Write an enzyme that holds these catalytic residues in place. Structure first.
Site, PDB file in Angstrom:
ATOM      1  N   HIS A 152      10.333  33.644  59.366  1.00  0.00           N
ATOM      2  CA  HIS A 152       9.702  34.874  59.542  1.00  0.00           C
ATOM      3  C   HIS A 152       8.339  34.236  60.087  1.00  0.00           C
ATOM      4  O   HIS A 152       8.017  33.241  59.812  1.00  0.00           O
ATOM      5  CB  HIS A 152       9.467  35.921  58.250  1.00  0.00           C
ATOM      6  CG  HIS A 152       8.766  34.747  57.095  1.00  0.00           C
ATOM      7  ND1 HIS A 152       7.423  34.671  57.200  1.00  0.00           N
ATOM      8  CD2 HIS A 152       9.290  33.981  56.297  1.00  0.00           C
ATOM      9  CE1 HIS A 152       7.180  33.925  56.065  1.00  0.00           C
ATOM     10  NE2 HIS A 152       8.280  33.483  55.622  1.00  0.00           N
ATOM     11  N   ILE A 193      13.472  32.425  74.076  1.00  0.00           N
ATOM     12  CA  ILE A 193      14.595  32.908  73.467  1.00  0.00           C
ATOM     13  C   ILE A 193      14.576  34.594  73.970  1.00  0.00           C
ATOM     14  O   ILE A 193      13.491  35.021  73.935  1.00  0.00           O
ATOM     15  CB  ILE A 193      14.851  32.984  71.940  1.00  0.00           C
ATOM     16  CG1 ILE A 193      14.748  31.406  71.510  1.00  0.00           C
ATOM     17  CG2 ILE A 193      16.230  33.304  71.573  1.00  0.00           C
ATOM     18  CD1 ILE A 193      15.649  30.105  72.097  1.00  0.00           C
ATOM     19  N   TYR A 245      -0.896  30.693  66.524  1.00  0.00           N
ATOM     20  CA  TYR A 245       0.479  30.659  66.508  1.00  0.00           C
ATOM     21  C   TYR A 245       0.868  29.027  66.670  1.00  0.00           C
ATOM     22  O   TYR A 245       1.488  28.464  65.564  1.00  0.00           O
ATOM     23  CB  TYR A 245       1.062  31.541  67.374  1.00  0.00           C
ATOM     24  CG  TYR A 245       2.675  31.091  67.541  1.00  0.00           C
ATOM     25  CD1 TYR A 245       3.528  31.732  66.739  1.00  0.00           C
ATOM     26  CD2 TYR A 245       3.219  30.382  68.697  1.00  0.00           C
ATOM     27  CE1 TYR A 245       4.886  31.764  66.879  1.00  0.00           C
ATOM     28  CE2 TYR A 245       4.559  30.080  68.720  1.00  0.00           C
ATOM     29  CZ  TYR A 245       5.603  30.678  67.856  1.00  0.00           C
ATOM     30  OH  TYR A 245       6.650  30.611  67.884  1.00  0.00           O
ATOM     31  N   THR A 262      11.061  41.193  70.913  1.00  0.00           N
ATOM     32  CA  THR A 262       9.759  40.491  70.852  1.00  0.00           C
ATOM     33  C   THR A 262       9.222  39.737  71.789  1.00  0.00           C
ATOM     34  O   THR A 262       8.166  39.850  72.537  1.00  0.00           O
ATOM     35  CB  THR A 262       9.546  40.128  69.534  1.00  0.00           C
ATOM     36  OG1 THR A 262       9.905  40.954  68.426  1.00  0.00           O
ATOM     37  CG2 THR A 262       8.203  39.294  69.076  1.00  0.00           C
ATOM     38  N   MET A 307       5.411  38.809  53.439  1.00  0.00           N
ATOM     39  CA  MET A 307       5.344  37.143  53.418  1.00  0.00           C
ATOM     40  C   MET A 307       3.756  37.221  53.279  1.00  0.00           C
ATOM     41  O   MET A 307       3.232  36.102  53.311  1.00  0.00           O
ATOM     42  CB  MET A 307       5.940  36.634  54.145  1.00  0.00           C
ATOM     43  CG  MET A 307       7.626  36.539  53.746  1.00  0.00           C
ATOM     44  SD  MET A 307       7.960  35.786  52.102  1.00  0.00           S
ATOM     45  CE  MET A 307       9.479  36.018  52.076  1.00  0.00           C
TER      46      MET A 307
HETATM   47  N1  LIG Z   1      12.065  34.283  70.426  1.00  0.00           N
HETATM   48  C1  LIG Z   1      11.609  33.216  70.834  1.00  0.00           C
HETATM   49  O1  LIG Z   1      11.306  33.183  72.122  1.00  0.00           O
HETATM   50  C2  LIG Z   1      11.130  32.302  70.105  1.00  0.00           C
HETATM   51  C3  LIG Z   1      10.592  30.851  70.740  1.00  0.00           C
HETATM   52  C4  LIG Z   1      10.129  29.894  69.865  1.00  0.00           C
HETATM   53  C5  LIG Z   1      10.280  29.869  68.659  1.00  0.00           C
HETATM   54  N2  LIG Z   1      10.457  31.162  68.015  1.00  0.00           N
HETATM   55  C6  LIG Z   1      10.592  31.311  66.321  1.00  0.00           C
HETATM   56  O2  LIG Z   1      11.726  32.014  66.137  1.00  0.00           O
HETATM   57  C7  LIG Z   1      11.476  32.885  64.853  1.00  0.00           C
HETATM   58  C8  LIG Z   1      11.940  34.162  65.128  1.00  0.00           C
HETATM   59  O3  LIG Z   1      11.640  34.761  66.274  1.00  0.00           O
HETATM   60  P1  LIG Z   1      11.968  36.131  66.800  1.00  0.00           P
HETATM   61  O4  LIG Z   1      11.762  36.194  68.308  1.00  0.00           O
HETATM   62  O5  LIG Z   1      13.330  36.346  66.275  1.00  0.00           O
HETATM   63  O6  LIG Z   1      11.034  36.969  66.228  1.00  0.00           O
HETATM   64  P2  LIG Z   1      11.222  38.695  65.842  1.00  0.00           P
HETATM   65  O7  LIG Z   1      12.479  39.309  66.541  1.00  0.00           O
HETATM   66  O8  LIG Z   1       9.774  39.394  66.315  1.00  0.00           O
HETATM   67  O9  LIG Z   1      11.281  38.864  64.337  1.00  0.00           O
HETATM   68  C9  LIG Z   1      10.430  38.499  63.520  1.00  0.00           C
HETATM   69  C10 LIG Z   1      10.722  38.855  61.716  1.00  0.00           C
HETATM   70  O10 LIG Z   1       9.941  38.690  61.164  1.00  0.00           O
HETATM   71  C11 LIG Z   1       9.684  39.540  60.089  1.00  0.00           C
HETATM   72  N3  LIG Z   1       8.251  39.646  59.569  1.00  0.00           N
HETATM   73  C12 LIG Z   1       7.328  40.004  60.462  1.00  0.00           C
HETATM   74  N4  LIG Z   1       5.957  40.132  59.956  1.00  0.00           N
HETATM   75  C13 LIG Z   1       6.272  39.775  58.588  1.00  0.00           C
HETATM   76  C14 LIG Z   1       5.551  39.847  57.322  1.00  0.00           C
HETATM   77  N5  LIG Z   1       4.197  40.194  57.207  1.00  0.00           N
HETATM   78  N6  LIG Z   1       6.346  39.628  56.168  1.00  0.00           N
HETATM   79  C15 LIG Z   1       7.699  39.234  56.234  1.00  0.00           C
HETATM   80  N7  LIG Z   1       8.455  39.120  57.345  1.00  0.00           N
HETATM   81  C16 LIG Z   1       7.826  39.803  58.568  1.00  0.00           C
HETATM   82  C17 LIG Z   1      10.042  40.856  60.980  1.00  0.00           C
HETATM   83  O11 LIG Z   1      10.694  41.770  60.186  1.00  0.00           O
HETATM   84  P3  LIG Z   1       9.638  43.112  59.722  1.00  0.00           P
HETATM   85  O12 LIG Z   1       8.459  43.386  60.611  1.00  0.00           O
HETATM   86  O13 LIG Z   1      10.491  44.339  59.343  1.00  0.00           O
HETATM   87  O14 LIG Z   1       9.032  42.503  58.280  1.00  0.00           O
HETATM   88  C18 LIG Z   1      11.225  40.196  61.559  1.00  0.00           C
HETATM   89  O15 LIG Z   1      12.623  40.396  60.944  1.00  0.00           O
HETATM   90  C19 LIG Z   1       9.944  32.719  64.476  1.00  0.00           C
HETATM   91  O16 LIG Z   1       9.696  31.732  63.538  1.00  0.00           O
HETATM   92  C20 LIG Z   1       9.302  32.293  65.914  1.00  0.00           C
HETATM   93  O17 LIG Z   1       8.375  31.331  65.704  1.00  0.00           O
HETATM   94  C21 LIG Z   1      11.052  32.245  68.718  1.00  0.00           C
HETATM   95 CL1  LIG Z   2       2.413  30.772  77.172  1.00  0.00          CL
HETATM   96  C1  LIG Z   2       3.804  30.253  76.234  1.00  0.00           C
HETATM   97  C2  LIG Z   2       3.830  30.481  74.721  1.00  0.00           C
HETATM   98  C3  LIG Z   2       4.869  30.212  74.064  1.00  0.00           C
HETATM   99  C4  LIG Z   2       6.216  29.932  74.548  1.00  0.00           C
HETATM  100  C5  LIG Z   2       7.282  29.573  73.563  1.00  0.00           C
HETATM  101  C6  LIG Z   2       7.319  30.542  72.389  1.00  0.00           C
HETATM  102  N1  LIG Z   2       7.400  30.088  71.252  1.00  0.00           N
HETATM  103  N2  LIG Z   2       7.400  31.222  70.399  1.00  0.00           N
HETATM  104  C7  LIG Z   2       7.483  32.467  70.971  1.00  0.00           C
HETATM  105  C8  LIG Z   2       7.433  33.590  70.728  1.00  0.00           C
HETATM  106  C9  LIG Z   2       7.332  33.928  69.270  1.00  0.00           C
HETATM  107  C10 LIG Z   2       8.240  35.238  69.042  1.00  0.00           C
HETATM  108  C11 LIG Z   2       6.818  35.241  69.007  1.00  0.00           C
HETATM  109  C12 LIG Z   2       7.357  34.578  71.821  1.00  0.00           C
HETATM  110  C13 LIG Z   2       7.412  34.228  73.224  1.00  0.00           C
HETATM  111  C14 LIG Z   2       7.691  32.793  73.253  1.00  0.00           C
HETATM  112  N3  LIG Z   2       7.528  31.821  72.552  1.00  0.00           N
HETATM  113  C15 LIG Z   2       7.832  28.290  73.469  1.00  0.00           C
HETATM  114  C16 LIG Z   2       8.653  29.200  74.035  1.00  0.00           C
HETATM  115  C17 LIG Z   2       6.209  29.855  75.999  1.00  0.00           C
HETATM  116  C18 LIG Z   2       5.143  30.147  76.833  1.00  0.00           C
END
Ligand SMILES: NC(=O)c1ccc[n+]([C@@H]2O[C@H](COP(=O)([O-])OP(=O)(O)OC[C@H]3O[C@@H](n4cnc5c(N)ncnc54)[C@H](OP(=O)(O)O)[C@@H]3O)[C@@H](O)[C@H]2O)c1
Ligand SMILES: Clc1ccc(C2(c3nnc4c(C5CC5)cccn34)CC2)cc1
Ligand SMILES: NC(=O)c1ccc[n+]([C@@H]2O[C@H](COP(=O)([O-])OP(=O)(O)OC[C@H]3O[C@@H](n4cnc5c(N)ncnc54)[C@H](OP(=O)(O)O)[C@@H]3O)[C@@H](O)[C@H]2O)c1
Ligand SMILES: Clc1ccc(C2(c3nnc4c(C5CC5)cccn34)CC2)cc1
Lengths: 263, 279
Positions: free
Chosen positions: A95, A193, A158, A197, A68
């Site tokens: 993503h 979550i 971010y 990662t 992407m």
């Molecule tokens: N997990 C949390 O605590 C948390 C908190 C707040 C918000 N979110 C949001 O939740 C969403 C998913 O997070 P997650 O924790 O599930 O992340 P994750 O497990 O690391 O997955 C990220 C995904 O993005 C893909 N990706 C990475 N680089 C890319 C690139 N250049 N082109 C295309 N695809 C790419 C990865 O696949 P490949 O490397 O194979 O491309 C992977 O499938 C994100 O939008 C994140 O901001 C997560």
């Molecule tokens: Cl200091 C701090 C910064 C961010 C966060 C929160 C957050 N937002 N995106 C993420 C990711 C993304 C998958 C990378 C990983 C870990 C925490 N994330 C809101 C919960 C909590 C604490």
């Protein structure tokens, strides 16, 4: 009130679907009997997700691998996904570029790459998907964070990209309303979550309760199906209570009488 | 006499009540200062006896601003013309400005790419250019300015909009870039706090202002009361001088009441305890 049958036979795109929340969304959609086209860079990991989606009961399941970072890939991917399914009902933008919790010093390349992947590609995907979504009176689902609504240290680049998604998609939502484009936009505001990662990233830095990825993925899909403008998902009752901005919505409405878009 | 003079302007009540003498002899950069709010800020700073380095693309318009700044009583006034589409120019501008003044106390980030009120269809080039000029160049200017600002315990002033806090139609690209400034600079403010970097960050949330650009842009499309550019420019400078985290400036007495988010501040203060930044 949501029912899993709302996704039965629906044509859904899920980006960043090889792992984490993205993969959980594909799995949920499969169980609901939707048509799915999943994307990420890893062809091998997308193959296993597709195979498992078919096992779970997806109406159809395909993958298109690519980065992407490439706006040409982003645009062509949607056309190809639409041709495979014979249309599009839901676009799930999930993503993000790889990041870590670190203080910002001088890494402008990481700030640019974050804006390109986490924001600009979402805009390209929307432009490419809008004609099909207008045809189906479809939905756009934008995955964001609490860090895309309030400030946090160690995530400057971010946070900027997630804030930009709010600015961009909330503006076009108001535009779609006046121009009678019946395509809903759901901004999902997620807390911590339990993805591999996030758990690795926060280890010894952040001391917070993590919510389950399976339930998170379902809440995103629910919000999209229900055409909710925003979804708020966090482990804490205090976070969900304070995260909402009632005054913003009041302000936007008071200023809604000041425009003429008959041009 | 200057060698025989010393002291501080910032004493009791200086965190609350502004005086024009707070800017006397201060080394200030103003971007997008050839016209509008930026020009008004340069003029106010000149009257306060500050050293000023103004920038925009138009060498001719910057020459007139500098000339008028010297007439108003600026300690010094210089211009460096260039485009903020060029990240090499943005970096080099800060070094050159710092050399002209012998340091830097305040960095005023005000420039924006040319924009209009239009419904979003497919102009990805305008979305990219908006992010590059309105946001990425601000980050490049901050990186280049931080060593000098750390030396002076200086200030960063970020000019934003109500459209960088709430949603408005016809400004999708623009609003995306203004929201990004909030995300980026509010995060580094928290970082500076823990890492004891005594550089303040002021985000200025402005409503409609009577600049030639804005009056032309909203003509027949947006019917809102516009606030005066002279007073707007002063309120930005006041906020910077007072090291206020945010400035809210609008024609409506009611906007000022609703635009603030007390819940955001509380949420942030509750999440602050959940970290370990001993690394
Ligand atoms: N997990 C949390 O605590 C948390 C908190 C707040 C918000 N979110 C949001 O939740 C969403 C998913 O997070 P997650 O924790 O599930 O992340 P994750 O497990 O690391 O997955 C990220 C995904 O993005 C893909 N990706 C990475 N680089 C890319 C690139 N250049 N082109 C295309 N695809 C790419 C990865 O696949 P490949 O490397 O194979 O491309 C992977 O499938 C994100 O939008 C994140 O901001 C997560
Ligand atoms: Cl200091 C701090 C910064 C961010 C966060 C929160 C957050 N937002 N995106 C993420 C990711 C993304 C998958 C990378 C990983 C870990 C925490 N994330 C809101 C919960 C909590 C604490
Ligand atoms: N006016 C309003 O109603 C309003 C409302 C809310 C917020 N604001 C904010 O206030 C700030 C100033 O707005 P304004 O109305 O006063 O603007 P303005 O009068 O149009 O001036 C913009 C300035 O930026 C410069 N500039 C333009 N393109 C540039 C580029 N590529 N590189 C470098 N400099 C560039 C211009 O000079 P050159 O063309 O010669 O380069 C000019 O000096 C902006 O941050 C704006 O978002 C304004
Ligand atoms: Cl529909 C709408 C969109 C934006 C706005 C506001 C606004 N923010 N920046 C601007 C500009 C900048 C010079 C370009 C021109 C006109 C209005 N602007 C908040 C007042 C009001 C209404």
């Amino acid at each position: 009130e949501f029912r899993p049958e709302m996704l039965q036979g629906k044509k859904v795109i899920v980006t960043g679907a090889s792992k984490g929340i993205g993969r959980e969304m594909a799995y949920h959609l499969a169980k609901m009997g939707a048509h799915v086209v999943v994307t990420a860079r890893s062809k091998e990991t997308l193959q296993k997700v597709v195979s498992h989606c078919l096992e779970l009961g997806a109406a159809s399941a395909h993958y298109i691998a690519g980065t992407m970072e490439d706006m040409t890939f982003a645009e062509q991917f949607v056309a190809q996904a639409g041709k495979l399914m014979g249309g599009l009902d839901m676009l799930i933008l999930n993503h993000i570029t790889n990041t870590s919790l670190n203080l910002f010093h001088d890494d402008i390349h990481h700030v640019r790459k974050s804006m390109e992947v986490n924001f600009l590609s979402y805009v390209v995907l929307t432009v490419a998907a809008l004609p099909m979504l207008k045809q189906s009176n479809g939905s756009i689902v934008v995955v964001s964070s609490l860090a895309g609504k309030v400030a946090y240290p160690m995530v400057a680049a971010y946070s900027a990209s997630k804030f930009a998604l709010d600015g961009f998609f909330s503006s076009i939502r108001k535009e779609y309303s006046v121009s009678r484009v019946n395509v809903s936009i759901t901004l999902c505001v997620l807390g911590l979550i339990d993805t591999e990662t996030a758990m690795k990233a926060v280890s010894g830095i952040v001391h917070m309760q993590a919510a389950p990825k399976e339930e998170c993925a379902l809440e995103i899909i629910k919000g999209g199906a229900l055409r909710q403008e925003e979804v708020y998902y966090d482990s804490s009752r205090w976070t969900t209570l304070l995260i909402r901005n009632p005054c913003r919505k009041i302000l936007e409405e008071l200023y809604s009488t000041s425009y003429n878009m008959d041009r």
